[PDB]
Amino acid sequence: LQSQFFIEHILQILPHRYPMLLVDRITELQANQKIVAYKNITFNEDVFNGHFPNKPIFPGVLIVEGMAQSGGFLAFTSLWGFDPEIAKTKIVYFMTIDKVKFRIPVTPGDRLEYHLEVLKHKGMIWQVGGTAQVDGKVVAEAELKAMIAERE
Amino acid sequence: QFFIEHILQILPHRYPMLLVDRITELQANQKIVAYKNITFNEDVFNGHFPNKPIFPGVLIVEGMAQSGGFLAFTSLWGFDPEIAKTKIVYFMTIDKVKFRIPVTPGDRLEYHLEVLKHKGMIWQVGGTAQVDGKVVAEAELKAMIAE
Amino acid sequence: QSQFFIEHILQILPHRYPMLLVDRITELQANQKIVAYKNITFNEDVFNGHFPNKPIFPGVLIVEGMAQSGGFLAFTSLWGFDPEIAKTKIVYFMTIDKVKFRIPVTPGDRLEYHLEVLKHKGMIWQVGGTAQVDGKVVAEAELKAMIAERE
Amino acid sequence: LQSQFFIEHILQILPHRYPMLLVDRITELQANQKIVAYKNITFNEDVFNGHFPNKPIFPGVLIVEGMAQSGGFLAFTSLWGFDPEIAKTKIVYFMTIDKVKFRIPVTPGDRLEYHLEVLKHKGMIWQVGGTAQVDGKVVAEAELKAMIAERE
Amino acid sequence: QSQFFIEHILQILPHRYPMLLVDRITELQANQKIVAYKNITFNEDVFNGHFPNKPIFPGVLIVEGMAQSGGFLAFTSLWGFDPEIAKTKIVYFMTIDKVKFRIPVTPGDRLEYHLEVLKHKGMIWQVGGTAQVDGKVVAEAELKAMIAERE
Amino acid sequence: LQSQFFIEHILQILPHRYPMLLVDRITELQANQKIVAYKNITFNEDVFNGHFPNKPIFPGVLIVEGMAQSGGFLAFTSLWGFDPEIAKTKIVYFMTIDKVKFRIPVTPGDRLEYHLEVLKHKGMIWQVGGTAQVDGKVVAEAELKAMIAERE
Numbered sequence: 001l002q003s004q005f006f007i008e009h010i011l012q013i014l015p016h017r018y019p020m021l022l023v024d025r026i027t028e029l030q031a032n033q034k035i036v037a038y039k040n041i042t043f044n045e046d047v048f049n050g051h052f053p054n055k056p057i058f059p060g061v062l063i064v065e066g067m068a069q070s071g072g073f074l075a076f077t078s079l080w081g082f083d084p085e086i087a088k089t090k091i092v093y094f095m096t097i098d099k100v101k102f103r104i105p106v107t108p109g110d111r112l113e114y115h116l117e118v119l120k121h122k123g124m125i126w127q128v129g130g131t132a133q134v135d136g137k138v139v140a141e142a143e144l145k146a147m148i149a150e151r152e
Numbered sequence: 153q154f155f156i157e158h159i160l161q162i163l164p165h166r167y168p169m170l171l172v173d174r175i176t177e178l179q180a181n182q183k184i185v186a187y188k189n190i191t192f193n194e195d196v197f198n199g200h201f202p203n204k205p206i207f208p209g210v211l212i213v214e215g216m217a218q219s220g221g222f223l224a225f226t227s228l229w230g231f232d233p234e235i236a237k238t239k240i241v242y243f244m245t246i247d248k249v250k251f252r253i254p255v256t257p258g259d260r261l262e263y264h265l266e267v268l269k270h271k272g273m274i275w276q277v278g279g280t281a282q283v284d285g286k287v288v289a290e291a292e293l294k295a296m297i298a299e
Numbered sequence: 300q301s302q303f304f305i306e307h308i309l310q311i312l313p314h315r316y317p318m319l320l321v322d323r324i325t326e327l328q329a330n331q332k333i334v335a336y337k338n339i340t341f342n343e344d345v346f347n348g349h350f351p352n353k354p355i356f357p358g359v360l361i362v363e364g365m366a367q368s369g370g371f372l373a374f375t376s377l378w379g380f381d382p383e384i385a386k387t388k389i390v391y392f393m394t395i396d397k398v399k400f401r402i403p404v405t406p407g408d409r410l411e412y413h414l415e416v417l418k419h420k421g422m423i424w425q426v427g428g429t430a431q432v433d434g435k436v437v438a439e440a441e442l443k444a445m446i447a448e449r450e
Numbered sequence: 451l452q453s454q455f456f457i458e459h460i461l462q463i464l465p466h467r468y469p470m471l472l473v474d475r476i477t478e479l480q481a482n483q484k485i486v487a488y489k490n491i492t493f494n495e496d497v498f499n500g501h502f503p504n505k506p507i508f509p510g511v512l513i514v515e516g517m518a519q520s521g522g523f524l525a526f527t528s529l530w531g532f533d534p535e536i537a538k539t540k541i542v543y544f545m546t547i548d549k550v551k552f553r554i555p556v557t558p559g560d561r562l563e564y565h566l567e568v569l570k571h572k573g574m575i576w577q578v579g580g581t582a583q584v585d586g587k588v589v590a591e592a593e594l595k596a597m598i599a600e601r602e
Numbered sequence: 603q604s605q606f607f608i609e610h611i612l613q614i615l616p617h618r619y620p621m622l623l624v625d626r627i628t629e630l631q632a633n634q635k636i637v638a639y640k641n642i643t644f645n646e647d648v649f650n651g652h653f654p655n656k657p658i659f660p661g662v663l664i665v666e667g668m669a670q671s672g673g674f675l676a677f678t679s680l681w682g683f684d685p686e687i688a689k690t691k692i693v694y695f696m697t698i699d700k701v702k703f704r705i706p707v708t709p710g711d712r713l714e715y716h717l718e719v720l721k722h723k724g725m726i727w728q729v730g731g732t733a734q735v736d737g738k739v740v741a742e743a744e745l746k747a748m749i750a751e752r753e
Numbered sequence: 754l755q756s757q758f759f760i761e762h763i764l765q766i767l768p769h770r771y772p773m774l775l776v777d778r779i780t781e782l783q784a785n786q787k788i789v790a791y792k793n794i795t796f797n798e799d800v801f802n803g804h805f806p807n808k809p810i811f812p813g814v815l816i817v818e819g820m821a822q823s824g825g826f827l828a829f830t831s832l833w834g835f836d837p838e839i840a841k842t843k844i845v846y847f848m849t850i851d852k853v854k855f856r857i858p859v860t861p862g863d864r865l866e867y868h869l870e871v872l873k874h875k876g877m878i879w880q881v882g883g884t885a886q887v888d889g890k891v892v893a894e895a896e897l898k899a900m901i902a903e904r905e
């Protein structure tokens with residue numbers, strides 16, 4: 001019912017944890033339709049130790065990962081709403097990834113904004129597409145299909 | 153075969169983003185077969201996911217990109233540690249990836265990449281990731297080598 | 300210059316992971332003031348234990364981030380963007396005073412450091428200012444440092 | 451109320467965890483009055499990776515953090531004694547820091563002794579002040595005011 | 603019985619990252635022997651300092667992994683795959699003798715542990731064997747474990 | 754030639770680095786005879802995260818590793834003294850370990866003192882033995898034979 005979520009609510013919905021929880025705040029959310037979130041990029045992240053020495057560049061694949069989590073938050077809330085209890089036993093598997101294009105490198109100090117739209121969704125299978133943006137510009141484009149499942 | 157110390161002399165990637173442990177097969181301007189061991193003792197598992205260790209699909213793709221990278225560096229300048237150290241690799245595009253089987257601690261993740269097309273510093277490769285002969289994922293990507 | 304990105308910052312401060320808390324410098328006035336910032340994201344080790352389920356960027360690290368900004372300020376003022384000389388210097392902080400924390404800092408915040416030169420006499424520099432998140436002051440502090448030869 | 455607490459007791463009272471729990475043991479404790487504790491400094495701490503390369507130096511701001519935590523243990527035990535139950539529902543916020551002076555650099559192999567006395571205390575607000583020592587000499591001095599708040 | 607994957611291992615052993623050095627149990631025989639392994643990959647924090655520009659999995663860790671396997675063997679021999687009882691027991695090692703290192707272990711290797719029960723009396727279990735990579739012996743060791751009640 | 758060394762000297766002799774450099778300081782050193790050194794044990798170490806949760810215990814094998822490093826520093830200096838040049842062209846690799854007995858658990862707050870005596874030395878082959886002590890009490894004991902090898 002809300003459209004603005006902070007790190008606290010994100011931890012209660014997504015199963016991801018450090019160092020793979022790549023969504024910091026949800027700024028906009030329209031159930032079954034779109035979501036806008038963002039992750040701040042800082043030099044104080046471990047992934048920078050090796051990507052790359054003396055040249056910090058946020059991995060392209062982790063940007064895709066960040067987008068998937070945004071969509072995963074959109075998918076869970078659209079299904080069961082904000083129910084951490086239900087969410088606490090679910091995980092999220094990647095099914096496919098297509099048409100991803102990287103236009104501008106993301107670096108420390110960047111506010112990487114995730115913009116996801118629901119292209120199609122069936123039960124637990126959600127297919128989203130959108131872009132990663134920094135200062136209003138598209139730094140990345142991507143389409144992906146993820147499935148949420150109950151931890152067996 | 154090229155072992156970890158050779159890989160270090162070519163790829164610019166370091167911990168914790170160096171996801172290729174050994175190169176078992178290489179054919180210039182053609183293909184490459186390499187792999188990375190998966191063990192619980194990897195930091196990514198603390199968060200992906202707690203109680204349910206699953207190697208991230210995106211990192212599977214990253215491992216293939218790196219395998220592709222080694223293939224490009226060596227095809228471009230051969231095994232030249234000197235040239236390599238001035239470069240880094242940028243992901244340009246990723247397409248047609250599909251995950252069929254989850255990778256978990258104890259798995260030997262094999263990368264199979266063939267050159268689909270290349271020009272200058274821009275290389276496009278495609279293939280699969282395998283575990284015990286079984287295809288756990290396929291993908292296509294285009295990377296760029298630069299200064 | 301007036302805008303230094305992470306690479307420029309890396310060539311001036313000796314600080315490295317996980318103690319380099321200045322991601323970018325948005326403005327610098329030799330001998331006057333500096334405005335920089337560090338993004339705060341959940342993907343930082345410190346949040347693992349401060350605290351579980353309640354990510355709150357440590358106040359001591361805000362102050363530290365403020366000290367680093369002042370250090371870049373004092374140094375650039377004296378020698379400008381000079382990587383070679385930076386390697387032979389040391390910015391050792393002697394005191395911290397009047398520190399106030401008004402509102403907590405959390406993942407998703409852009410922690411802006413605002414520091415100015417309160418006093419400069421020889422090797423001793425005294426800076427002061429605030430850390431701000433979206434125009435609102437979240438913390439303040441006065442710090443004194445001494446410039447010196449590395450060893 | 452004890453006066454000799456170990457890491458096991460400390461884990462049960464303070465909310466801090468790795469890599470921010472900077473107190474290893476409590477040696478002396480006088481409810482509402484003073485406390486003596488310490489943190490061993492070893493090269494095997496991640497913080498030394500970047501502070502600094504080739505020459506390890508425990509950060510001063512972190513020494514102040516350790517004194518604050520010592521103070522917190524005193525406050526908690528002062529208000530509820532050793533009660534892990536009510537202690538789990540809390541966290542400690544830094545309110546102010548004053549008169550901190552750094553006299554001697556702290557390094558790997560040092561036994562950082564935290565010396566703190568209560569300057570003032572009302573309810574959840576505790577104002578403490580003292581020194582951090584190593585082998586009997588004062589390496590740092592500081593005053594701080596913390597607050598214990600419901601993890602609401 | 604049969605083979606256990608990391609999941610099952612997590613339910614018996616109390617060890618967690620970065621100290622759980624057994625990824626899979628491919629063979630177990632009550633009161634007799636165990637065959638397990640840990641994959642060695644460059645992506646392990648340990649390789650940062652052992653050593654720079656020269657990754658070599660520590661020998662004492664090869665030994666730690668043999669102990670964990672041996673411990674796993676003794677525990678399951680008495681109680682089988684019983685998670686509840688596992689939280690009830692403590693398996694620490696009293697002794698370690700006859701340790702020999704023959705070949706360096708590096709990223710890409712599959713460190714296979716081969717431990718057999720030499721002798722056991724009550725809760726004192728003595729195991730011994732080798733660490734193997736590609737069928738060859740990279741290390742040998744004998745360890746004595748004591749099984750106790752947690753707390 | 755000296756008998757007291759600090760982490761800054763240790764770093765110039767041993768190649769070990771975080772998180773495997775387990776000797777913080779050397780308080781005693783007698784060529785070809787013995788070495789007494791120590792490593793502080795603090796909760797702020799990665800190892801404790803999983804060994805074990807809610808029960809920090811410094812790994813016995815790590816105590817042994819620490820003893821081996823001291824032996825290594827001893828072996829090298831006995832032969833070349835404090836020589837950074839040569840030190841970084843050689844490596845002390847261990848061939849065997851015997852009679853290892855763990856008597857008392859090591860925990861955060863402990864000062865793990867390493868005591869190694871030279872049992873036999875002939876060229877590059879060194880056999881040493883000793884104990885790990887905490888507050889004058891033996892917590893561990895072991896014997897090792899090391900080989901000083903070329904680094905290339």
Ligand SMILES: COCCN1C(=O)/C(=C\c2ccc(-c3ccc(Cl)c(C(=O)O)c3)o2)S/C1=N\c1ccccc1
Pocket residue numbers: 616617669692693694695752753805806807808810813855856857858
């Ligand atoms: C390799 O031997 C292990 C070292 N060791 C222990 O593990 C000891 C007890 C122990 C192990 C695990 C736990 C434990 C306790 C509470 C919890 Cl909550 C957990 C958990 O949650 O995972 C685990 O306690 S004692 C010991 N070493 C020695 C050494 C010498 C004498 C006695 C013990």
Ligand SMILES: [Cl-]
Pocket residue numbers: 092093094207208209210
């Ligand atoms: Cl995935």
Ligand SMILES: [Cl-]
Pocket residue numbers: 057058059060061241242243
């Ligand atoms: Cl990239």
Ligand SMILES: [Cl-]
Pocket residue numbers: 356357358359542543544
């Ligand atoms: Cl705080």
Ligand SMILES: [Cl-]
Pocket residue numbers: 507508509510511
């Ligand atoms: Cl400092």
Ligand SMILES: [Cl-]
Pocket residue numbers: 659660661662847
């Ligand atoms: Cl070793």
Ligand SMILES: [Cl-]
Pocket residue numbers: 695811812813814
């Ligand atoms: Cl142990």
